[PDB]
Scaffold this motif. Structure first.
Motif, PDB file in Angstrom:
ATOM      1  N   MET A 165     -32.647  11.966  83.619  1.00  0.00           N
ATOM      2  CA  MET A 165     -33.424  11.107  84.498  1.00  0.00           C
ATOM      3  C   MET A 165     -32.533  10.385  85.489  1.00  0.00           C
ATOM      4  O   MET A 165     -32.925  10.326  86.619  1.00  0.00           O
ATOM      5  N   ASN A 166     -31.282  10.057  85.199  1.00  0.00           N
ATOM      6  CA  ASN A 166     -30.318   9.478  86.127  1.00  0.00           C
ATOM      7  C   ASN A 166     -29.863  10.533  87.123  1.00  0.00           C
ATOM      8  O   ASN A 166     -29.744  10.215  88.292  1.00  0.00           O
ATOM      9  N   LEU A 167     -29.753  11.798  86.702  1.00  0.00           N
ATOM     10  CA  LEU A 167     -29.525  12.974  87.546  1.00  0.00           C
ATOM     11  C   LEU A 167     -30.799  13.423  88.272  1.00  0.00           C
ATOM     12  O   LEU A 167     -30.759  13.895  89.403  1.00  0.00           O
ATOM     13  N   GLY A 168     -31.955  13.158  87.672  1.00  0.00           N
ATOM     14  CA  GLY A 168     -33.260  13.413  88.260  1.00  0.00           C
ATOM     15  C   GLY A 168     -33.689  12.325  89.225  1.00  0.00           C
ATOM     16  O   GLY A 168     -34.379  12.657  90.169  1.00  0.00           O
ATOM     17  N   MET A 169     -33.179  11.103  89.056  1.00  0.00           N
ATOM     18  CA  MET A 169     -33.145   9.951  89.944  1.00  0.00           C
ATOM     19  C   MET A 169     -31.951  10.066  90.884  1.00  0.00           C
ATOM     20  O   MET A 169     -32.077   9.620  92.005  1.00  0.00           O
ATOM     21  N   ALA A 170     -30.945  10.898  90.602  1.00  0.00           N
ATOM     22  CA  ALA A 170     -29.756  11.003  91.440  1.00  0.00           C
ATOM     23  C   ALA A 170     -30.113  11.615  92.778  1.00  0.00           C
ATOM     24  O   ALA A 170     -29.895  10.993  93.806  1.00  0.00           O
ATOM     25  N   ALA A 222     -23.372   8.174  94.452  1.00  0.00           N
ATOM     26  CA  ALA A 222     -22.870   8.453  93.120  1.00  0.00           C
ATOM     27  C   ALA A 222     -22.680   7.182  92.247  1.00  0.00           C
ATOM     28  O   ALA A 222     -22.898   7.234  91.045  1.00  0.00           O
ATOM     29  N   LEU A 223     -22.347   6.028  92.826  1.00  0.00           N
ATOM     30  CA  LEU A 223     -22.192   4.718  92.214  1.00  0.00           C
ATOM     31  C   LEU A 223     -23.531   4.161  91.854  1.00  0.00           C
ATOM     32  O   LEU A 223     -23.571   3.529  90.831  1.00  0.00           O
ATOM     33  N   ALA A 224     -24.601   4.508  92.559  1.00  0.00           N
ATOM     34  CA  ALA A 224     -25.963   4.124  92.250  1.00  0.00           C
ATOM     35  C   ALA A 224     -26.490   4.889  91.045  1.00  0.00           C
ATOM     36  O   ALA A 224     -27.218   4.338  90.233  1.00  0.00           O
ATOM     37  N   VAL A 225     -26.040   6.133  90.872  1.00  0.00           N
ATOM     38  CA  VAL A 225     -26.363   6.934  89.684  1.00  0.00           C
ATOM     39  C   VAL A 225     -25.602   6.436  88.508  1.00  0.00           C
ATOM     40  O   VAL A 225     -26.132   6.277  87.418  1.00  0.00           O
ATOM     41  N   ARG A 226     -24.327   6.193  88.749  1.00  0.00           N
ATOM     42  CA  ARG A 226     -23.539   5.508  87.795  1.00  0.00           C
ATOM     43  C   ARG A 226     -24.122   4.119  87.541  1.00  0.00           C
ATOM     44  O   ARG A 226     -24.285   3.766  86.392  1.00  0.00           O
ATOM     45  N   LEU A 227     -24.758   3.507  88.542  1.00  0.00           N
ATOM     46  CA  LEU A 227     -25.196   2.130  88.475  1.00  0.00           C
ATOM     47  C   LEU A 227     -26.390   1.941  87.514  1.00  0.00           C
ATOM     48  O   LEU A 227     -26.595   0.974  86.784  1.00  0.00           O
ATOM     49  N   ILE A 244     -26.049   0.841  83.036  1.00  0.00           N
ATOM     50  CA  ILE A 244     -27.108   0.197  82.298  1.00  0.00           C
ATOM     51  C   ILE A 244     -27.440   1.060  81.120  1.00  0.00           C
ATOM     52  O   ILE A 244     -27.564   0.579  80.012  1.00  0.00           O
ATOM     53  N   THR A 245     -27.616   2.348  81.403  1.00  0.00           N
ATOM     54  CA  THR A 245     -27.770   3.371  80.399  1.00  0.00           C
ATOM     55  C   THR A 245     -26.594   3.315  79.439  1.00  0.00           C
ATOM     56  O   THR A 245     -26.805   3.206  78.252  1.00  0.00           O
ATOM     57  N   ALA A 246     -25.372   3.166  79.922  1.00  0.00           N
ATOM     58  CA  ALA A 246     -24.203   3.143  79.081  1.00  0.00           C
ATOM     59  C   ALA A 246     -24.168   1.868  78.241  1.00  0.00           C
ATOM     60  O   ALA A 246     -24.167   1.962  77.028  1.00  0.00           O
ATOM     61  N   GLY A 247     -24.349   0.698  78.837  1.00  0.00           N
ATOM     62  CA  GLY A 247     -24.341  -0.613  78.215  1.00  0.00           C
ATOM     63  C   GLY A 247     -25.483  -0.784  77.227  1.00  0.00           C
ATOM     64  O   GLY A 247     -25.234  -1.009  76.050  1.00  0.00           O
TER      65      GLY A 247
END
Lengths: 109, 58, 47, 131, 217, 72, 72, 72, 72, 72, 72, 72, 72
Positions: E91-96, E146-151, E155-158
């Motif tokens: 979904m972060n890649l699908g939102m990417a 790419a920082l927005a996907v990471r961004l 959140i996903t990571a934390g």
């Protein structure tokens, strides 16, 4: 004419008196004079007034009285902060200056 | 009440649709979720006054 | 308090000298008015 | 906008005039009071005042001392002890004064006197700014 | 198939009810129901409209749909687990692409060569230096995208680490709870500090970026 | 050795983003204390904060190019 | 060589967060000292501290994604 | 050994751009609060900012000259 | 190699706590300068100092998580 | 070992230029936030800025002479 | 390798004491520039000096705990 | 081993000289803003700045002695 | 490995002296910009500077004893 009236326990309670400011006008020069020396004296703020004849119109003046305050300390309190940039310097060095400004002014009134 | 029940069902579905979750990984996040409630209810009592009134005003 | 509030020095004291020094500066034309505008008919007594 | 009141006991130049900025020889040195500059109270230094008035003008001045006041209110008050447009200072005098002044500093010998000469010297400097 | 296929329809449908329910509130009823739900888009039309227009009403509602969609999509990665490490990443890649494409719609689509001509002509990029424009085209786009996907992915990571450290603490101390409850109680509160904060700042990035679009628009 | 040193070498080049990370907090910090002194927010001041985040992420983009050169 | 260098690659990539944590202390400090001068706290300035604590953590999510790439 | 230590040693010299990137946020940030007290924008202040960032990124271009000399 | 590089990688991630340590000092230092300007010590400014120690220890807990993952 | 460790030994001494990189930004940045208070720009302040930049590139003249010793 | 990496891993966590030692230099610095503003020297400021040097040395005592754990 | 890791031990010891270089600017830069408040140049502040340059370059001398120790 | 990585472990422990060196510059700088406000030179501000440079090189003596443990 201040000396004149004042004698009413106000021969001991004068601190200083300034003199002949009319008959050849007063000035800022004067004002500064009266201002300066005034300070020095352990009299500073003890509240009171600067009571002067505030000119109002040709036909009128109304004699004023003021609050006279110069304690940098209560000019710690309040708004002092708000219009920032302040020090018991600059405070004083306005307090001073406005004392002068007023002193002059009032006088001229 | 109905909204709350729907949100719970969703959480369950998602827990079940996975490889392997630990008792742990869940409980944590469950107390994370759990913590929010107590504040949320005290806030929720206030919440209503805004929005229903904001309709009525507009 | 440095050199115009010295250790002491009125800001006035200073100030007036400043301004005075300005008055000293400038042209003469103006200076006629100067002292004129900075009399000190303030004679003084304590009473 | 900022309402600039520029006066000396002698003159009022501006009285709360919608000036966009005035850059001040306060004892700060300056702070170039912007219409969006926090209200603040300042004691004036001898230096120059530049009145960036919302009108495509910056007007030039020297002020000796006094206090400048930046009210919360849109009004800024230069209450200049001596207030001049740089227009009336005398350059010639300045230099001449300045040598002399320094000289006197060389002979100054009360903290105060020294202060004073120096003040004077300085004065000539702060005048010298313009001059 | 079903697992992915149930999730994406669900994400749409949770946004679809709010997106249908507010349009509905424009005359009926309201009872408890409509007026209660009207609060949802009153909260959107209260909260987000405090920042929007801004860029103009024109764009406002276009972004607010994405702002709610992003937060709602992350909320549909909040409850689920496991979900964050795989499905929220997909979904972060699908939102990417939507995040990349979100700058595309008006920025890169109208100007790919210089979408900073819509975003920031003189600022981040040196306008004297088309080299720095193209350079800062990554730090304003290619990397920020790419920082927005990471961004959203941190959140996903934390969020994930709360669940993972998580789980790693009661998996460590499967005592029921017991001493894991102490660390676990912290790791929880890390839910708020990590996901609920970073989740915020992730939509704050979408806010600012779509502000910088539509503030220069 | 050939696949080893390029996998530990791409990690050391990612310590160049610690400069752009704190360098972005300062340029956006002095703009928070600058607009506190007021009031030329839009244009001049906050238009320079973009010129200060671009010259700081330029070394970040230069460091993220190095770590991607040993990774691909 | 292959199994080892990926563990000493996500370790040096975690030294890029040393800017995202200190830069956030720089921006939130300048908002702590900025609000002291007053008065735009519940608007304007503290709404710029959220835009600063994000751009600082923007090199803290870009660096964290590289340490999550070398591991898994 | 002769080619392996040339890939993990060009990565440690990429951490020398951490000073040029954090220093650029200090050379522009102290120019943001500098023009906040104002008023010499063009000339004097921003002119001194250009001669400062050139002396800040010089330790970034010389550090990328010791980086590219280990890989090329 | 595999049981070796885990110890020379979990240690390099503890160098990510350099931003969490110097971020706590900067966020508190400007809070000590902000409360020196007075007067809202009880909430508003020192309350925000808690909201600045949290967004600065978060980039220190995420870095300590990666160090703990390469050790256990 | 002898020639191999001379390559990853001048690369770790090249990251010492990060102190001189941001130190030149802190020195020249303070001079930009100093001449803004005015007016002793010519001499006094900018002349002292050449004393601070030399004492900051002094560590840069001792760190670049270290990496150039492990080279040839 | 098994005995080698513990020694190389203890030093790497000892580099995380560079953030605590400068975070104490910022907190005690902004208290030295926070006492010049006057007058509550005892209490308020210097009483929060140990309260700001506790959360900043907390990152050092946790880092020197990860450095000692790889030694014992 | 004996001749190898002594070369990669002096290089990381030269990275401890990155605190003195950025310490030199933050100590001779605060005195570049001290005389901006004036007028203690060649009196108190510039005299203490040398006593501030010595306390910071000594932590560069105690680090260059470790770099010379692992070189002779 | 045993008689090797301890020589490259004392190099990484000497990187902790980048906080005791850059913490002294932050401390003995704010006591130079604070004495510019005047007139608490002796007994107050410089006396607190002795207690400021006591908790600054305390992280450096703890970092000079960590490298001394990886040598003697």
């Amino acid at each position: 004419k201040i000396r004149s009236i004042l004698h009413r326990t106000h021969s001991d309670q004068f601190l200083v008196t300034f003199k002949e400011v009319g008959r050849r006008p007063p000035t800022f020069g004067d004002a500064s004079v009266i201002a300066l020396e005034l300070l020095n004296s352990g009299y500073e703020f003890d509240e009171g007034s600067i009571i002067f004849n505030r000119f109002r119109s040709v036909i009128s003046y109304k004699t004023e009285e003021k609050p006279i305050f110069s304690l940098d300390t209560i000019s710690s309190a309040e708004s002092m902060s708000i219009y920032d940039d302040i020090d018991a310097d600059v405070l004083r060095n306005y307090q001073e200056y406005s004392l002068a400004n007023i002193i002059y002014y009032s006088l001229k009134e | 009440p109905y909204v709350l029940g729907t949100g719970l069902i969703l959480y369950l579905l998602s827990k079940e649709i996975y490889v392997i979750t630990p008792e742990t990984f869940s409980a944590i996040s469950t107390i994370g979720f759990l913590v929010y409630i107590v504040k949320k209810y005290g806030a929720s009592v206030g919440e209503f006054a805004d929005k229903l009134n904001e309709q009525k005003i507009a | 308090v440095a050199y115009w509030r010295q250790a002491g020095l009125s800001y006035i004291r200073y100030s007036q000298i400043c301004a005075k020094a300005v008055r000293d500066a400038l042209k003469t034309e103006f200076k006629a008015n100067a002292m004129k505008t900075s009399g000190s008919t303030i004679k003084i007594v304590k009473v | 906008q900022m309402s600039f009141t520029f006066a000396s006991p002698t003159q009022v130049f501006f009285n709360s005039a919608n000036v966009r900025q005035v850059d001040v020889p306060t004892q700060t040195g300056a702070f170039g009071i912007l219409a969006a500059h926090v209200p603040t109270l300042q004691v004036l230094r001898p230096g120059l005042v530049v009145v960036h008035a919302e009108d495509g003008t910056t007007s030039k001045y020297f002020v000796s001392s006094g206090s400048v006041t930046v009210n919360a209110d849109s009004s800024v008050q230069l209450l200049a002890e001596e207030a001049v447009t740089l227009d009336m200072l005398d350059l010639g005098a300045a230099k001449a004064n300045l040598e002399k002044a320094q000289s006197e500093l060389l002979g100054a010998a009360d903290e105060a006197t020294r202060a004073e000469i120096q003040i004077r010297i300085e004065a000539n400097e702060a005048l010298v700014k313009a001059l | 198939i079903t697992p992915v296929i149930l999730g994406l329809p669900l994400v749409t449908l949770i946004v679809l009810f709010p997106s249908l329910l507010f349009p509905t509130s424009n005359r009926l009823v309201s009872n408890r129901f409509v007026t209660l739900q009207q609060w949802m888009l009153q909260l959107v039309s209260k909260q987000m409209m405090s920042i929007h227009n801004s860029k103009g009403q024109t764009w406002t509602l276009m972004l607010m749909s994405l702002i709610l969609f992003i937060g709602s999509t992350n909320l549909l990665g909040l409850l689920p687990h496991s979900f964050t490490p795989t499905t929220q990443l997909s979904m972060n890649l699908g939102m990417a692409i939507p995040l990349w494409a979100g700058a595309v719609i008006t920025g890169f689509r109208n100007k790919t060569k210089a979408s900073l001509a819509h975003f920031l002509p003189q600022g981040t990029p040196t306008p004297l230096i088309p080299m720095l424009v193209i350079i800062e085209t990554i730090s304003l786009f290619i990397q920020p995208m790419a920082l927005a996907v990471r961004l959203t992915a941190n959140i996903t990571a934390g969020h994930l680490l709360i669940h993972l450290i998580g789980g790693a603490t009661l998996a460590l101390m499967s005592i029921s709870t017991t001493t894991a409850l102490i660390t676990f109680t912290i790791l929880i509160l890390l839910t708020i500090l990590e996901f609920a904060v970073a989740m915020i700042q992730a939509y704050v990035f979408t806010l600012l970026v779509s502000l910088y679009l539509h503030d220069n628009t | 050795i050939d696949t080893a040193a390029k996998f530990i070498g791409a990690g050391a080049a990612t310590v160049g983003v610690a400069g752009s990370g704190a360098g972005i907090g300062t340029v956006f910090g002095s703009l928070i204390i600058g607009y506190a002194r007021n009031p030329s927010l839009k244009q001049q001041l906050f238009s320079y904060a973009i010129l200060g985040f671009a010259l700081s992420e330029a070394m970040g983009l230069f460091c993220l190019m190095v770590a991607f050169l040993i990774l691909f």
